[PDB]
Amino acid sequence: AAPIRVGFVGLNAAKGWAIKTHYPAILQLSSQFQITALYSPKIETSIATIQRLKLSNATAFPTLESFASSSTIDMIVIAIQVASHYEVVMPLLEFSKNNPNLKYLFVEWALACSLDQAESIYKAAAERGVQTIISLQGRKSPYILRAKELISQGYIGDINSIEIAGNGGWYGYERPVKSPKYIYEIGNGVDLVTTTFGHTIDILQYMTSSYFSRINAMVFNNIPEQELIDERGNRLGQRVPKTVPDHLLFQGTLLNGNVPVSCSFKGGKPTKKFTKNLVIDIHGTKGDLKLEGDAGFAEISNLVLYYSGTRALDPGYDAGKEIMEVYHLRNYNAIVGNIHRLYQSISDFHFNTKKIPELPSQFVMQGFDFEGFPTLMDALILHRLIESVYKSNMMGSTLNVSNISHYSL
Amino acid sequence: AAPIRVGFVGLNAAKGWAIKTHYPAILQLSSQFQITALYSPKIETSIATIQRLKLSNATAFPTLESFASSSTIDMIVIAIQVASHYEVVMPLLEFSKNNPNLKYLFVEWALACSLDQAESIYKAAAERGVQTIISLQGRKSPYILRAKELISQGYIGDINSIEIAGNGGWYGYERPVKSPKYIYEIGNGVDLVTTTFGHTIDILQYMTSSYFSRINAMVFNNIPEQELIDERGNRLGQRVPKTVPDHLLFQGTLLNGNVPVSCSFKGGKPTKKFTKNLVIDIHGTKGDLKLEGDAGFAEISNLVLYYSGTRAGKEIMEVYHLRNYNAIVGNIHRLYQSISDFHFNTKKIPELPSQFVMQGFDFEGFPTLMDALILHRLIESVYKSNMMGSTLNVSNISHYSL
Amino acid sequence: NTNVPIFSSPRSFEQKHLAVVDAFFQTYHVKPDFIARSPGRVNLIGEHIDYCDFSVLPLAIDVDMLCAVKILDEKNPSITLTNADPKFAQRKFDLPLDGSYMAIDPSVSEWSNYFKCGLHVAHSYLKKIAPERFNNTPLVGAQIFCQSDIPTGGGLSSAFTCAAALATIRANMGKNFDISKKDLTRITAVAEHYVGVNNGGMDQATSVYGEEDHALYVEFRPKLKATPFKFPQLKNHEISFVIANTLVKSNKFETAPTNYNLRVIEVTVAANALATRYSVALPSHKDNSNSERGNLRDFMDAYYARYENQAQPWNGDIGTGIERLLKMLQLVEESFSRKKSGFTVHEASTALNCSREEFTRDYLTTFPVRFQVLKLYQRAKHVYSESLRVLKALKMMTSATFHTDEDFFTDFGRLMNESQASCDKLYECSCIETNQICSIALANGSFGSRLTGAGWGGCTIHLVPSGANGNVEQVRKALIEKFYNVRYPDLTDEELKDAIIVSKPALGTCLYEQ
Amino acid sequence: NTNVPIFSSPLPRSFEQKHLAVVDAFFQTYHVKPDFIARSPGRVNLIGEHIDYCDFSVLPLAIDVDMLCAVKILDEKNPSITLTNADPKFAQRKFDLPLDGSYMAIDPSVSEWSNYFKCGLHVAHSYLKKIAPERFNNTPLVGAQIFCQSDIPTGGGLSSAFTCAAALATIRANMGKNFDISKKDLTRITAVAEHYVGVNNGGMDQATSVYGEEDHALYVEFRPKLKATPFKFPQLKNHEISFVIANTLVKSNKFETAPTNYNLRVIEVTVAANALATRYSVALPSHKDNSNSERGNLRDFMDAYYARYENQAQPWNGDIGTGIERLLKMLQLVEESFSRKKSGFTVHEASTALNCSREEFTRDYLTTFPVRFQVLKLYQRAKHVYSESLRVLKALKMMTSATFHTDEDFFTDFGRLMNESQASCDKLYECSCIETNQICSIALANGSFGSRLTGAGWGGCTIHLVPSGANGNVEQVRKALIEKFYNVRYPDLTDEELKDAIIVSKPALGTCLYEQ
Ligand SMILES: Nc1ncnc2c1ncn2[C@@H]1O[C@H](COP(=O)(O)OP(=O)(O)OP(=O)(O)O)[C@@H](O)[C@H]1O
Ligand SMILES: Nc1ncnc2c1ncn2[C@@H]1O[C@H](COP(=O)(O)OP(=O)(O)OP(=O)(O)O)[C@@H](O)[C@H]1O
Ligand SMILES: OC[C@H]1O[C@H](O)[C@H](O)[C@@H](O)[C@H]1O
Ligand SMILES: OC[C@H]1O[C@H](O)[C@H](O)[C@@H](O)[C@H]1O
Ligand SMILES: [Mg+2]
Ligand SMILES: [Mg+2]
């Protein structure tokens, strides 16, 4: 009955993603979660944030050790820049042994800047013995859940083939003069492939309940320099370097059914004139399913889902007629909503709301289950897939990735 | 001048492609072309065809040798099954040395069943020293020519990226009981990759004026057995083997601008429910061009072309669709016209040479056997890429260093 | 009459008042500042026509939603929601310090969404009347206890949204801010749309305008209007309507894509297929998601303005209305009678003279929907014929005299039976339980029996003579023995008592000050 | 007369002269005498440019230049048509007729002179199939040797005269010497003939070519039915009414420019009609037989607006006064609707004005004929159409006026209507050109009372209202044009070319056949 006490590294009232997503999600669940702790390298920032958001149950901690050691925390949320995850999480995990109450470690995607760091973080987290969560909140999108339902229940029959087209938003020819350099530089754990393809391709695996068998990728830097623009979109006459990718070609096969998947991710603008900028098109033996989005990345955007097919809540249908479904939620705020539904699932698990008679204390991964939430193991498997995308590009070869979902040590 | 006298191998009044396409084209150009010769293994087939089509200037030849040696032929057209191209064209070319009048050899795509046979045919045709033509008639589609104009004249700026989606028609889960087995068995020079992807990817190269730098392909036989269906679409309770592919994934880069290209070719039915079955989407720095087709392979389909971009400094919108255009007859007809324009030098060019090696990316003229060979080398590399599990560098395949 | 009535201290209403005050105290350990009350409703006739803008014939009943409220003006402002029925788990949410609107997740069935949507429309209303006080600062927090004895099918969802909005306005404007009935009804009209149900304005209007011992004539066009009326005084008989609960499992939200929301879509498509066939244009409603592309009354008006001496829109006159609706039923026959099997998406597109893609964009993208066919014939026929039956019911109810008491019970009863037949065979929103209840009722003292509310479960109503010289007890006994005892053997004395209720028209929305 | 007239000899001398010369050229070409000659005249439109495809009435006349198709019918085992042109820049064509009677394909993607013959042959073929199925269904048409000779200048409706002559020749060659060809059927089947060649034109030119007669202009109406009423120019006291035609000599390329010029105009007025209909909540009919306006036109809007909001008004049954009031109403609605968007509508704004998506707008208005644009000028195009139609009605009144005016009043008033029409074509419809504008100005300063382009524009021809007779201005105008335009822009024109650049025609006989 006691709220889950949350400690944040990276909640800042004046900027960042956590203030836009985690924070509003928590307000909606204020009997289930309470913010009790903040840590930032500058104490002033934590103090300013606690003031502005009136976080009356929160304490600003002066050091990582004091924060991580504190027994006032049940769940730690890491929402700082990915380039800082490893250097923060590793010592934190060790200090957190001083806290016998710690039950959850919740990290933003991407987990780390390289597979090696992801592997080390995962190992340390498993060693700590806490339930882990990764923010792959596309798995909690109502659109993704509905699609997963249709597929799993047999509405498209077997999957024949899949096409995916996405857009990375920032990696086109121009860059706003106010955009921060860090998302455009290699090694910072944020880029078209790791971040945007990351969310989208994991969404695909989740919806179809299959990992990949074989993959081939080509990664491009055809735009080594972007043109600075003002807010009105006018070029200011100055170029700046972009070392991260501006295009991704990916193709491969789903393990279940050897299903062909073709993907192209455009870096940014110009947007497409005659085609939606986000499309997931799934062709089955018995029906088709298509998800399209006008605005934004799959994991934070309001989509439309189209379905038509047959399997030839109980509805009385005619055997020789296609069923049509359209699924769109007009007033759905996906930026707040998908994260909110992720918190809801953490809450449901913690308080055992469904009252499932034998729900274990912890689970290693969500995998393709509807229930629960994605963990650091689901994150690690995604990192292994991203690594193979980069390796495939580097070696000029189609890679067998059929075993990346298996862990040994 | 006198009409180009055409000899056909494979013109059958009762069936096949030539009767649906080449024949009606010649009727429309009856002053530029005349059919003077037919050859078929069964002379009765030629005689019947000559009778039924009232081919008053044509003779049915008893043997390949007598056909190929005949001085009454200026242009030989080969429109038989691809599986027979090599066994016919090789001795034909040699016999054809007895005909001092031979100026053109016209072959349907695909040229051959393997790259090796393609190379041998090309070498034989080059040595014979006649002008060659391949039927990549997508290059004479008004839709393709208009797109090529827009691109080449700068209307989309530099090309950022390209997506292609196509359908092979026959290679889904069901097969009509009346459908001929040969198009479903490997080694017959007819399949999703060789034929349908071939036409479409050559079209792309032509429209963008670029060959490929690097490619990777995955080739699928997820449907090793198809269900026979009656003409009404009902399954008859019997499967038959399919050894040719039912899917193609292809990705790579155009040499010109290192342009990303993503392709997916679906084998057949079911067709897509929410997307056109043929799409070529070209994204540029200054505009986009998209070609869509609801019916038919690109090289025989009436398409719609969409353009939007800038070249005042405001956005231009163009839609290009010809409602009454018959592309099945039309594209072939436009190919015949280009052969005729070349032959009679109709555009009055004072120093137009007698022969050329290849069209390449040129607007003028027509695709040759060299253009066909280069496409064969690309197709071979697609299959090799799949077999090796490798991204191949094919930047030099357009070089005939021999 | 203009404003929502306010009270301080119907022997039944006092008992509940004290009962909820103590439940609130037991939950929150303090006494509440006020109680917002909003009653359930039944519709005598006129089902599934309100979202087509046709007038209806409802009344408020003696069951209500009670929201007891303690105001808490101490940031961090938060709202705690407790339900007397423990199956609706307690919620708590902090108000945005912005004070931006709170998000609502319309993808799930959630009891607090109804409170949240009433809160939202109130919030928006407040920012319009008092921009300086409400634009950049949150609402007051609150502890709230919700208790309802409205059976499912009794317009509980709308009573809840009305009570929620009422509470939000009262808590933020203060004790003596008069709250308009007209405004309360206007702002709540679209409230449930935010939670995934594309309903009409009948239930909100009824809850707000209800009056003790009066039924209501509720109109939506040309203006929202609710006229109270008493049942006719008969020679020696009491007119009454008994409500019987089907006890069917409540899931309107889960089935909306194939049931409630599909119907609304079907009637919009029908209106537009008619307009296309007769070469008239319909208005484009931008105020309401019911029918952004025009509805069946818009078609009636458009048809008449084009073909009947450029006639002005129907103003609600009974005689005129019967005439025009009879014409409409003719056009439905000519237009759709040859397509009783229904229209596939391709056929509906053709009928509207547009592509499948454009049809999908214009009609299928507003609320989730799932179907094989759209039954334009049956759905339009229902709406036009049902609207016709309301007009007939109204003229009866407003007649000062009738030949005999029997005549009234038989004629009015017949209209109800026709309405039921139509809801069942044409609109297909009845159910086995409904059908069983009605037939039994009719065979045992009822003159007319029909579902009320959305259907697919819910409640049923029955016209029965009440009082020492009536059939009330004959009907009740027959239902208990032949229906409830059979299908639901385990019902407890109280449940059984609750499954059947006799109500007089009740007072509308009101506040109790503490 | 009901049927196309047939002659074997002479009609003014001019006909037999041109007739003998084309017989000579045919003979020199084919080494045999032809069996018959299909003739169809060019035309000028006095007033009413670019409104025929909007279904508004026009005021044209056939002129004494024409298309002559001399034909020899062939008895062939392989039936074929050979087409030779008097002008060697139109190279000879020959094609075999499908032996099973099927239709020949037409490639609408290229400009080709024989496409006009082919589309005329196509509509005639389809007509032959309808009236004699059991004999044209599965058997080929008859072969022929054909020689084509036109002295119609570009802009004189040559393309339509040609299509009309081709269709006529095709019916005559296949039905024989004793088959009556009705003017009604001929005008009907050729109405949509050019649509097969890529040009989305109206019915003015075909109707004029067919319904022309000696010394009569025509009032041509399209709704509710095609109607052509001949009338003579008013008898003036001591001046004769003449229209001098002057060719701009601008390079002909209507087909190549159609996506930005002629076909775009047609799209703009359909879009304008539907934006008006949307704004005023009325539905337009769904034309199923003609590609001009499958979604309705500006006359459809006028009718639909009156049916909905003006039920009490008296009907318009070709009454001029009433017609004028309805058009003045339309002009008001155009101001209220589009006057704040004189910069034009982008594809997105047009879609919004029609209350649909860009995709549906594109499918519904932009995929019928190739088109290319930055904006659609709904205001200017609709303003032109309604005002131009109003000018036709006032012109008609003058031509058939009972109330009498001085000779000078006629010339000044009728000229003013022509001048207002030119200003509207130039500034509102944007279908004039520099050469047109220069010719019209020189003409007006040198004896013309009214000068405007005729035909589609973007080049082509112009017409000039001049007094002829004892003291007319015909020669005054000619010399000023030669000196001030032709010598200046085309210094190297032969005397022959100059003679042909400026002509004076009387109304001429419509379509006809010469036997032998
Ligand atoms: N006692 C309650 N308190 C608060 N919310 C409730 C209560 N009972 C039901 N609800 C909510 O109302 C929902 C039912 O809405 P619904 O509109 O179908 O009922 P109704 O208003 O009674 O029916 P109808 O509109 O047909 O009259 C339930 O799913 C639940 O979320
Ligand atoms: N002497 C000719 N004989 C046959 N065809 C001709 C001849 N001259 C021109 N043409 C054809 O007619 C086409 C011109 O069509 P166009 O409609 O623009 O002329 P027009 O009928 O005179 O003009 P307009 O419709 O504006 O009055 C040319 O492109 C060419 O194909
Ligand atoms: O008559 C049906 C009735 O049912 C629903 O529940 C709605 O709340 C009402 O608006 C009304 O549509
Ligand atoms: O008035 C313009 C005129 O010009 C064109 O060329 C057409 O052939 C005619 O139908 C007519 O539109
Ligand atoms: Mg309700
Ligand atoms: Mg013309």
Residues of C numbered 327-356 whose beta carbons fall under 8 angstroms of chain D's beta carbons: which are they? Answer: 353-355
Distance, in Å, from the CA atom of C387 to the CA atom of C267, rounded to the nearest integer, reads 14
Mention the CATH class of domain B1-140+323-368: alpha beta
Atom from ligand 3 closest to the CA of residue C199? 10
Domain with CATH 3.30.230.10 in chain C: 1-233+504-514
Domain with CATH 1.20.1440.340 in chain D: 257-431
Q: Which residue, by CA, sits nearest to atom 4 of ligand 2?
A: D113
Q: Which of D278, D281, D306 to mutate to test the interface with C (most CBs of C within 10 A)?
A: D281
Closest-CA distance, B172 to chain D, in angstroms, reads: 30
Q: For the structural domain made of C1-233+504-514, what CATH number should be given?
A: 3.30.230.10
Atom from ligand 2 closest to the CA of residue D161? 21
C-D interface: how many C-beta pairs under 8 angstroms? 40
Catalytic-role residue among C53, C62, C203, C298: C203
Q: Which residues of C touch D308 (CB under 8 A)?
A: 305-306, 310
The chain D residue lying nearest B28, using CA atoms, is: D95
Distance, in Å, from the CA atom of C64 to the CA atom of C166, rounded to the nearest integer, reads 14
Count of helix runs (H) and strand runs (E) in chain D: 18, 14
Written as six digits, the tokens of C302 are 């458009």
Domain with CATH 3.40.50.720 in chain B: 1-140+323-368
* Contact assignment for B218 to A216 by CB distance below 8 Å: yes
Which CATH entry fits the domain spanning C234-254+430-503: 3.10.310.30, 3.30.70.3170, 2.30.40.10, 3.40.50.300?
3.30.70.3170
Classify residue C7 as left (phi > 0), alpha (psi -120 to 50) or beta.
beta
Residue C275 sits at the chain D interface (C-beta within 8 Å): yes
Amino acid found at D397: K
* Contact assignment for B247 to A288 by CB distance below 8 Å: no
Q: Which residue, by CA, sits nearest to atom 25 of ligand 2?
A: D157
Residue C310 sits at the chain D interface (C-beta within 8 Å): yes
Instruction: Of D344, D342, D343, D316, give the one whose Cα is nearest residue D329.
Output: D316
Helix/strand/coil (H/E/C) assignment for every residue in D340-408:
CCCCCECHHHHHHHCCCCHHHHHHHHHCCCCEEECCECHHHHHHHHHHHHHHHHHHHHHHCCCCCCCHH
* Contact assignment for A287 to B273 by CB distance below 8 Å: yes
C153 lines ligand 1 (CB under 6 A): yes
Domain with CATH 3.30.230.10 in chain D: 1-235+506-516
Mention the CATH class of domain D257-431: mainly alpha
Domain with CATH 3.30.360.10 in chain B: 141-322+369-402
Q: Which of A326, A330, A335 to mutate to test the interface with C (most CBs of C within 10 A)?
A: A326
- Residue in the structure block whose two tokens are 């479409």: B200
Which among C45, C50, C451 is the best mutation to test ligand 3's pocket, defined by most ligand atoms within 8 Å of the CB? C50
Which among D87, D106, D113 is the best mutation to test ligand 2's pocket, defined by most ligand atoms within 8 Å of the CB? D113
The architecture CATH gives domain B141-322+369-402: 2-Layer Sandwich (3.30)
Which among D61, D204, D266, D369 is the best mutation to test ligand 4's pocket, defined by most ligand atoms within 8 Å of the CB? D204
Written as six digits, the tokens of B149 are 């104009």
The chain B residue lying nearest D366, using CA atoms, is: B319
Contact (CB, 8 A) for B99 and B73:
yes
Q: For the structural domain made of A141-329+376-409, what CATH number should be given?
A: 3.30.360.10
Q: Which of B317, B334, B337 to mutate to test the interface with D (most CBs of D within 10 A)?
A: B317
Q: Please tell me the experimental approach by which this structure was elucidated.
A: X-ray
Distance, in Å, from the CA atom of D162 to the CA atom of D38, rounded to the nearest integer, reads 10
Distance, in Å, from the CA atom of C312 to the CA atom of C424, rounded to the nearest integer, reads 34
Instruction: Of B394, B140, B165, B116, give the one whose Cα is nearest residue B281.
Output: B165
CATH fold for the domain made of A1-140+330-375: Rossmann fold (3.40.50)
Q: Which of A262, A263, A289 to mutate to test the interface with B (most CBs of B within 10 A)?
A: A262
Closest-CA distance, D290 to chain C, in angstroms, reads: 17
Helix axes D183-190, D204-211, angle to 10 degrees: 160
Domain with CATH 3.30.360.10 in chain A: 141-329+376-409
Of A173, A274, A290, the CB nearest to B285: A173
| Local structure of C255: helix, strand or coil | helix
Atom from ligand 2 closest to the CA of residue D86? 1
Taking the mean position of all CA atoms in its chain, how far away is CA C410? 26
- For residue C152, report the distance from its CA to the centre of ligand 1, in Å: 6
Residue B311 makes CB contacts below 8 A (sequence gap 6+) with B153, B154, B155, B286, B287
Residue C425 makes CB contacts below 8 A (sequence gap 6+) with C378
Catalytic-role residue among D55, D64, D185, D205: D205
Helix/strand/coil (H/E/C) assignment for every residue in chain B:
CCCEEEEEECCECCECHHHHCHHHHHHHCCCCEEEEEEECCCHHHHHHHHHHCCCCCCEEECCHHHHHHCCCCCEEEECCCHHHHHHHHHHHHHHHHHCCCCCEEEEECCCCCCHHHHHHHHHHHHHHCCEEEEECHHHHCHHHHHHHHHHHCCCCCCEEEEEEEEECCECCCEEECCCCHHHHCCCCCCCHHHHHHHHHHHHHHHHHCCCEEEEEEEEECCCCEEEEECCCCCEEEEEEECCCCCEEEEEEEECCCCEEEEEEEECECCCCCCCCCEEEEEEECCEEEEEEECCCCHHHCCCEEEEEECCCCCCEEEEECCCCCCHHHHHHHHHHHHHHHHHCCCCCCCCCCCCCCCCCCCCCCCCCHHHHHHHHHHHHHHHHHHHHCECEECCCCCCCCC
Determine whether A383 is exposed, middle or buried from the number of CB atoms within 10 Å of its CB (0-12, 13-18, 19+). buried
Verify whether residue D205 is a known catalytic residue. Answer: yes
D460, containing H or E segment: none
Atom from ligand 3 closest to the CA of residue C47? 1
**Touching subunits for chain D (3+ Cβ pairs under 8 A):** B, C
C108, containing H or E segment: none
Q: What is the DSSP string of C499-512?
A: HEEE------SEEE
Torsion of Cα atoms, B22 then B25 then B27 then B32, to 10°: -100
Q: Which residue, by CA, sits nearest to atom 23 of ligand 1?
A: C153
In terms of C-beta distances under 8 Å and separation of at least 24 residues, what long-range contacts does C435-439 make, across chains too? C436/C483, C436/C487, C437/C244, C437/C246, C437/C479, C437/C483, C438/C462
Of B266, B272, B391, the CB nearest to A397: B391
C39 lines ligand 1 (CB under 6 A): no
Distance, in Å, from the CA atom of D69 to the CA atom of D71, rounded to the nearest integer, reads 6
C58 lines ligand 1 (CB under 6 A): no
Atom from ligand 4 closest to the CA of residue D194? 8
The dihedral through the CA atoms of D431, D435, D437, D440 has a sign that is negative
Which among D57, D205, D262, D461 is the best mutation to test ligand 4's pocket, defined by most ligand atoms within 8 Å of the CB? D205
Distance, in Å, from the CA atom of B90 to the CA atom of B113, rounded to the nearest integer, reads 14
* Contact assignment for B273 to A262 by CB distance below 8 Å: no
Q: For the structural domain made of D1-235+506-516, what CATH number should be given?
A: 3.30.230.10
D236-256+432-505: in CATH 3.30.70.1150: no
- For residue D61, report the distance from its CA to the centre of ligand 2, in Å: 18
B-D interface: how many C-beta pairs under 8 angstroms? 83
> What residues are in contact with ligand 2 under a 6 Å CB criterion?
D 85, 87, 90, 111, 113, 116, 148, 150, 154-160, 162, 252, 254-255, 455-456, 460
Distance, in Å, from the CA atom of D189 to the CA atom of A330, rounded to the nearest integer, reads 52
Please, what's the b/e burial string for C406-415 (b: 16 or more CB within 10 A of its CB; e: otherwise)? eebbebbbeb
Residue D29 makes CB contacts below 8 A (sequence gap 6+) with D84, D145, D147
Q: Which residue, by CA, sits nearest to atom 7 of ligand 3?
A: C199
* Contact assignment for C358 to D359 by CB distance below 8 Å: yes
Which CATH entry fits the domain spanning C255-429: 2.40.160.40, 1.20.1440.340, 3.30.300.30, 1.10.10.60?
1.20.1440.340
Ligand number nearest CA of C151 is 1
Amino acid found at A305: L
Count of helix runs (H) and strand runs (E) in chain A: 9, 18
Closest-CA distance, A297 to chain C, in angstroms, reads: 19
Residue B241 CB coordination number (10 Å): 10
Distance, in Å, from the CA atom of A382 to the CA atom of A392, rounded to the nearest integer, reads 15
